[PDB]
Design a binder for this molecule. Structure first.
Ligand SMILES: Nc1ncnc2c1ncn2[C@@H]1O[C@H](COP(=O)(O)OP(=O)(O)OP(=O)(O)O)[C@@H](O)[C@H]1O
Ligand SMILES: Nc1ncnc2c1ncn2[C@@H]1O[C@H](COP(=O)(O)OP(=O)(O)OP(=O)(O)O)[C@@H](O)[C@H]1O
Ligand SMILES: Nc1ncnc2c1ncn2[C@@H]1O[C@H](COP(=O)(O)OP(=O)(O)OP(=O)(O)O)[C@@H](O)[C@H]1O
Ligand SMILES: [Mg+2]
Ligand SMILES: [Mg+2]
Ligand SMILES: [Mg+2]
Lengths: 523, 523, 523
C-alpha cells in the first residue's frame, strides 16, 4: 505494498529539508578551517578523514521523504566523483544552491520546466566559457600544487603525483599502491607500456576498474605468434606454479594460443592474460622484441621469424607487476637488464641513422618511448593501516584531477573560476521571465563554492565575494593565508575537468528534483 | 474469509472518493503547465517522468473500498494504453467526469441502467461523428508534430518517428532500441520484410510482445525447401556457436527442416526461428532469392531448383538484427551487398520490361518494395540509463499514435475534437428522461479534457471552453502559446485512434461502476 | 541501516565523557596506593589483578557515542601494550590529559588541525629530548629494580628477569613458562640459539606470536644437507611416534628435505620444523656440529662431508624444548652431554690458537657464544592457576620492558622524565597561536603521570609536582616511601622505550579524536 501519495507542496519541502541536512553536513567539511569528518565504525576507533564523500556515505534520514531528497542529491557527489575523482563537496554545495533557489521559485508560482531550461542554458554557456578561460598545466611544482589543492591540503601527495608525471609524463603509466612502508613514496620502475587490451574480458582480475593485475608474473614473449600448445607447454607449467601469473605477449593475441590461455586459466591452472605485440604488421615484431629485451628473456623474434617454440624458459621474462587495462598492457619493472634494454636502444638509434625516411623514424621513436617511457608508482604512506588506506584515496583522486589538469589545463581555484564565469553571463537571457529566473538561479549558485570556503574560514562571505567580483582575472581570495592575490601565482588551481563536472552534475540532479508534481512511497 | 457487506449509498461514495484521488493525481500531470511526476524508488533518486501512467501505477489507497474504486478506473488508462499507447491521462479525466456526474444522477434517484444506456448511445454516435471529422496524415513535419503532441512536448521524438516513417513508410518496419548513445537517433538499415510469421509459436523470445528477436543472427536461405538435415548440418553448427541465432528462410517453413529447428533450439543448441519464402508458388522462389541477395549469401534458388544442400556456408547470410512477429519476418541490415541488392533490382526491373502482363508487373513491384522498403530504427536518447529508458517509452508511444494517425487520420488536438463532436450531438435523445440525462452526462464529460488542459495552464476553463465552443471547425486554444487559432494549422493533432479509445474505455469502465447495488469485501 | 547524524559540539562532549569514564577507571589503578582491579567472571570468584589493561578490557558504555570515545582511547593502551608491553595506564592518563585540554581549546574556537600540529611538534621534540636524557642499564640489581617498577611492585619478577638476563644476556633467549610449581622460578638450561627462522611459514604452532614451539622434540642434525628421503626415513618415523616433534637442522634448510617435512607435517604424521645450519659456507658446517654436540647425537659433519644418511638414530638429539621464531632457532636444554659440549669448546679453543687470523678468531667466538650463550627460563609462580596465569603476564611485561631498557637505557621513573622533558621545551613554538596552544596542551599533559601517581598516594599533586619541577635532573618523588630524592639512586627507573611509546600513542589517538566535524552512527 500500500502506498502513501501526496501531492503538491508537501513533496518539495520534504526534499529540500533532506538535501539541506546532507549538504550542510558535507559543506563544512569543505574549507580548510574545518578539518576532517568522523565516520563511526562498528568496532574500534572512528575513521577520521576529510572527505566530503566520507560524510555523504553516512547520511540517511528517518523521514522517508527527506531521506529521498538526501539520497537524490547524494547522486551528485557520486557521479562527480566517478567522473573526475574530486570536487564532490563543491558539486554538493552547487546543487544545494540551485535546488534551494529553484524550489523557492517554484513555490512562488514559476514554471518548473522553464526554470530547468534556464538553468540548463546557463550551465551550457558557462561550460563553454569555462573552456575559454582554462589554461594548461606546467612543470612538477605546478602539478604538485594542483594535486595538493585537489587533495585538500595534502601538499605531499601533490608533490608525489607531480614528480611521477614528470618521470613518465602521461604516457608512462602512473599507478598507486599501498605504501611499502609509512611514507609517501614515488619511484619509476621500468614500465614498458604498449597498446593492447586483454582478450577475453574474462581475464579481469581483482581491480573492479576493468583491469588485471598480476604480481611478479612470468612473461612469455611469443615473438612469432604462438603456433602450438607445444610451444606454450614449458612456460604454461612454469606459470602453473602458484602465485606466478602468466602474461602472454605473442605476435598477436592468438586464436590457438589465446584459446588455450582462456581454457587453462578457466580451470584454475596457470592464471593468464594475453595481449598482442604492439602495432601491426612489421613494427609489431620489432615491438614484441622491445618487450623481450625489457622482460629479459629475449625471444627469437617474429622479425627473425623464430617462433614461440624458439621461445623457451630463457624467453620467459618477469616483472614485479603488470597491468592490462583500458590504457594498454603495462609491464612495471622487468627482468630484462638495463644492459639489454639500453643496448636495444642503441640499435634502434642507428636504425634512425640508416632509415631513409621519416616513417621509419616515427615508428622507431614510438618504440623507444614505449620501452623507455617507464612507469611511476605512487605508494600512499602507511602506519597505520587506516591512515594508509585514507592517504591512498587522496593520492588517487589528486592524481586523477592533476591528470585532467595536464590535458586541457586548470583554472583559478578557491571558487573564483565559477565567479568569473558567472559575471561574464550577466546578460544571458532565455525565452521568457521564468527561464530568466532559472538563469539567475544558476549564476547565483556559482558563487556558493567561494562563499562556503570563506565561511569555513570564519570570514564574511559577502565581503570577500564582493571584493573578488570587484577585481578580475585570476584575482581571488587565498583562504589559507587570508590574503587576496593572483590565484595562479599563489598556486591555487583546479583542473577544469573537476570544476566542469561539479557544475554539470549539480545542475543535472537539481533540474530533476525541481519538478515534482506528486510523490509516491510505501506506507 | 469473513466478509463485510454493504449496501446502498455507502459503496458509491467510497468508489467516487477512490477515483477522485487517482484522477486528481493523474490529471495535473496533463497540461504542459504542470510538468513531470515523480515516482519514488526504493534505492537512489526518484524517477521523473511526465507519465500519467507513471503516476497511476503508484496509486493505492488505504480504505479498502476507495482503493477498489481507484483500481477500477486505473483499468481505463491501462486498456487505452494497450490499445493506442497514448491518451491514458485523457481517458482518465473523461472517466472521472462521467463517473462523477453519473453517480450524482444515481444518488438523485435516476435509473443506473438507463444512465448507462444513455452514456453508451452518446459514445456510439460520438465515435461515428469522430470518424466523420477525422482527417488523414501528411508528410514528415505533420508526422513529427503529431508525434510530439502524442509524446507530450517531446518534439525531438516527434521528428524522429516522422522521418522514420518517411523512409520506410508504414511498410518498412519501424523499430525502437535503446540508443547506442545519448541522442535521438533515426537510421534506415536494410530491412527486408516479408510476410510470414514463425513456424512454431515456441520460437518467441524475450520480447513479450509475441515476437522473436535475434541479434546478428545467421540467415540460412534454403531456397529450395529444405529436404535434409544433411543440408542444415553445416549452417546449424555455424549457428551452434553462441550468440549467433539462426534464421531459416526456406521455400516454405518445412516439416523436415522446421521439425529439426524446433528440436534443436529445444535443447539449447542453436536457437533458431523459421519462416517461409514469401508468397506461394512461383513468386515464393523469386522472393526467397531477394532475401538471399539482401543477406548476402545468395543461395542457388528454388527457382533454379537448387536445394538447401546447394545452399552452403556462403549461402548463409547475416544481419545486425531480425524480428519475426505479427507483421512479418523483418531483416534489419544485411550481409548482402548493395552491389548484389541493386543488381537484383536491375534484373527484376527488366523483368517488368519483358513481362507481358500486369500480373507479372504487380508481383515484381511487390518484391522490390519488400527488398527496398527497408527498415527505420529509432534509438531513444541515452545518458543516463534512467532518462534513456524513459525517452524510449515516449518514442514508442508517439510512434504508435502517429502510426494510427497515418492510417485513418488525426483530429484537432487540445481537446477540441471531442468538444466539436459533443456540440453536434446536442439533439441526441434516448428512450426516456434518465437515458437523456446519461447522454448529457457523456456530452458534458467530453469537455473535460480541454478544460483540464486549460486549468493546468493557469487559465480559466469556462472562459476558454466557452470561446472554443463559440467558433467551429478546427478553431481551438493553443495551450503552449495561450493563443486561439486553427489547431491543424498550428500542428496540434491527435490520432483519431487515441481519442476514440480514450473515450470508449472511459465510458466502458464508467458504465460498470455506475451500478453497484451491494458491495462485498474481506473484513 | 538508518543512521543518526550529528554535528557540531554534541559529538565532542560525548567523546570526552566516554574517555573520562575509561581513563578514570584505569588511572586509579595506577599508583601504589590504589591496589588491584577486579574483573568479574561469569563463574567462580572475580579476577584480581592490578592491570590497568584488565580494567580497560571491561569498559563498554551504554550511550553509543560515549562508548565510541571509550573504545577509541582504549586503542592507546592496546598499541602501547603491543609495542612495549608496559605503560598502558601511563599512556591512558597522557591521552586523557591531551584530549581534555585539546577539546576545550576546540570548544574555545581554536583550529583543530593547528592544535594537532602543535601537539605533534611537541611530541616530536619531546621524544628527541627523551633520547638525549635516557641512560643505559646496568647489572642484575638495576635490571631487577626496573623490572619490578615495570611490573608494578612485583620485586620478585624483577629479580628473576634481571638474573635471567645476567645468565644469557640479551643473546641467550629468555623465555617464560607457567611455573612448574608455585614459585618464581628461574633457571638456565642449555639454550643453543642460532639465527634461522623456520623454512616454511606454515610451521607456526600454538604460539600466536609467529613462533613454534616443540616440547621434548627430536633433533635431526643433518650435517650434510639432506640429500634423500632415505636419510630422513629413520628419524621421521622416530618422530612419527606422537608427542615428539621433530626439528630438522640440516646444512641448509633443504628443498628436498624441507619439501618432505612440509608434506609430512601437512598430513599430521610427524610434526616438524626445519632450519639451516647456521651461517653460510664453511662456518655453517662447523656450527651445524655445535648443535649436534649440544643435542647429543653428534652427526658426522658436513665439514667432514658425511651426510644425513651418515646421520642416524644416534645422530638424533633431544631437548626439553625448542623455539623457532623471529630471533632464531633456540634449543633449550639438550641431550648433548656437557662432556661433549665442553669438549667441543676445548677443540674450538685450540682452533683460536692455531688460527692465523682474526677472521677465524671471530668466527670461532661466534660459535662458542651461540653454544654456550645458553637460555634462561622464567617460570611464573603458581598455585592457584589464576594467580599463576596473572604473575606470568607481569613477568612477561616486566621482561619486555627491561629488555628495552638494557638496549638503549632507562630514564627516571615516577613520571619525572616527562616532567624534565616538558620543562626543557618551555620555549618551543609553532607557526601560530593555535599551534602554540597545542604545544602547551602537550607539555601540560606530560605532568599528568606524576600527578596521578601522587594523587593515588593520597598526597597533593600540585605541591609534589611543584617541588619536583623545582629541582632538576633525576630529582623526583618516591611514592613508595613518600620521600624526595634521586630517582636513579632509589632504583625507580622506566625503560625509555615504554615512556616514549606511551607518549606517542597517547598523542596519536588524541590528535585523531580532536577533529570531529560530524558524527554518524546507527539509529
Ligand atoms: N588555499 C586555498 N584557498 C582557497 N580555496 C582553496 C584553497 N585550497 C583549496 N581550495 C579550494 O577548495 C576546493 C577543493 O577542496 P576539496 O577537495 O576539499 O573540495 P572537494 O573536492 O569538493 O571535497 P572532496 O575532495 O571531499 O570531494 C577547490 O575549489 C580548491 O581550489
Ligand atoms: N500545444 C498544445 N495545446 C493544447 N493541447 C495540447 C498541446 N500539446 C498537446 N496537447 C494535448 O495534450 C494531450 C496529450 O498529452 P499527454 O500525452 O500528456 O496526454 P495523455 O496521452 O493523456 O497522458 P499520457 O501520455 O501520460 O497517457 C492531447 O489531447 C494533445 O492534443
Ligand atoms: N616507588 C615509585 N615511586 C614513584 N613512581 C613509581 C614507583 N614505582 C613505580 N612507579 C611508576 O609507576 C609507573 C609504572 O606502573 P604501572 O606498570 O602500574 O603503570 P602502567 O605500566 O602504566 O600500568 P600497566 O602496567 O597496567 O600498563 C612508572 O612510571 C613507574 O616509574
Ligand atoms: Mg576534493
Ligand atoms: Mg500521451
Ligand atoms: Mg605497567
Amino acid at each position: 505494498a500500500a502506498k502513501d501519495v501526496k501531492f503538491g507542496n508537501d513533496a518539495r519541502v520534504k526534499m529540500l529539508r533532506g538535501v539541506n541536512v546532507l549538504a550542510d553536513a558535507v559543506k563544512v567539511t569543505l574549507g580548510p578551517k574545518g578539518r576532517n569528518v568522523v565516520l563511526d565504525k562498528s568496532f574500534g576507533a572512528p575513521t577520521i578523514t576529510k572527505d566530503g564523500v566520507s560524510v555523504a556515505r553516512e547520511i540517511e534520514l528517518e523521514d522517508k521523504f527527506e531521506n529521498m531528497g538526501a539520497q537524490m542529491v547524494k547522486e551528485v557527489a557520486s557521479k562527480a566523483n566517478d567522473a573526475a575523482g574530486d570536487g564532490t563537496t563543491t558539486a554538493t554545495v552547487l546543487a544545494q544552491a540551485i535546488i534551494t533557489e529553484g524550489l523557492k521559485a517554484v513555490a512562488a508560482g514559476m514554471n518548473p520546466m522553464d526554470l530547468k531550461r534556464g538553468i540548463d542554458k546557463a550551465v551550457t554557456a558557462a561550460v563553454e566559457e569555462l573552456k575559454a578561460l582554462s589554461v594548461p598545466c606546467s612543470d612538477s611544482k605546478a602539478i604538485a600544487q594542483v594535486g595538493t589543492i585537489s587533495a585538500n591540503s595534502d601538499e605531499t601527495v601533490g608533490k608525489l603525483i607531480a614528480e611521477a608525471m614528470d618521470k613518465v609524463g602521461k604516457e608512462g603509466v602512473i599507478t598507486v599502491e599501498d605504501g611499502t612502508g609509512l611514507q609517501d613514496e614515488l619511484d619509476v620502475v621500468e614500465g614498458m607500456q604498449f597498446d593492447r587490451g586483454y582478450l577475453s574480458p574474462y581475464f579481469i582480475n581483482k581491480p573492479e576498474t576493468g583491469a588485471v593485475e598480476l604480481e611478479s608474473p612470468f612473461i612469455l614473449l611469443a615473438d612469432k605468434k604462438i603456433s602450438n600448445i607445444r610451444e606454450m607447454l614449458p612456460v604454461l607449467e612454469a606459470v602453473a606454479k602458484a602465485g606466478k601469473p602468466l602474461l602472454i605477449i605473442a605476435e598477436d593475441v592468438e586464436g590457438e594460443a589465446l584459446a588455450t590461455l582462456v581454457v587453462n586459466t578457466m580451470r584454475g591452472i596457470v592464471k593468464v592474460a594475453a595481449v598482442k605485440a604492439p602495432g601491426f604488421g612489421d613494427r609489431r615484431k620489432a615491438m614484441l622484441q622491445d618487450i623481450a629485451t625489457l622482460t629479459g628473456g629475449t625471444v627469437i623474434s617474429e622479425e627473425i621469424g623464430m617462433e614461440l617454440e624458439k621461445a623457451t624458459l630463457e624467453d620467459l621474462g618477469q616483472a614485479k607487476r603488470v597491468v592490462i587495462n583500458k590504457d594498454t598492457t603495462t609491464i612495471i619493472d622487468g627482468v630484462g637488464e638495463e644492459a639489454a634494454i639500453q643496448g636495444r636502444v642503441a640499435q634502434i638509434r642507428q636504425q634512425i641513422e640508416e632509415a631513409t625516411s621519416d616513417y621509419d623514424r616515427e615508428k622507431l621513436q614510438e618504440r623507444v618511448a614505449k620501452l623507455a617511457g617507464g612507469v611511476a608508482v605512487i605508494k600512499v604512506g602507511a602506519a597505520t593501516e587506516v591512515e594508509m588506506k585514507e592517504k591512498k584515496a587522496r593520492v588517487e583522486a589528486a592524481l586523477h584531477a592533476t591528470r585532467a589538469a595536464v590535458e586541457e589545463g586548470v583554472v583559478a581555484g578557491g571558487g573564483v573560476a565559477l565567479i568569473r564565469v558567472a559575471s561574464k553571463l550577466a546578460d544571458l537571457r532565455g525565452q521568457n521571465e521564468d527561464q530568466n529566473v532559472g538563469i539567475k538561479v544558476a549564476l547565483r549558485a556559482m558563487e556558493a563554492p567561494l562563499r562556503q570556503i570563506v565561511l569555513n574560514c570564519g570570514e564574511e562571505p559577502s565581503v570577500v565575494a564582493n571584493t573578488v567580483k570587484g577585481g578580475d582575472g585570476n584575482y581571488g581570495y587565498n583562504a589559507a593565508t587570508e590574503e587576496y592575490g593572483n590565484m595562479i601565482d599563489m598556486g591555487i588551481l583546479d583542473p577544469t575537468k573537476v570544476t566542469r563536472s561539479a557544475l554539470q552534475y549539480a545542475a543535472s540532479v537539481a533540474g530533476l528534483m525541481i519538478t515534482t508534481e506528486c510523490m509516491v512511497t510505501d506506507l
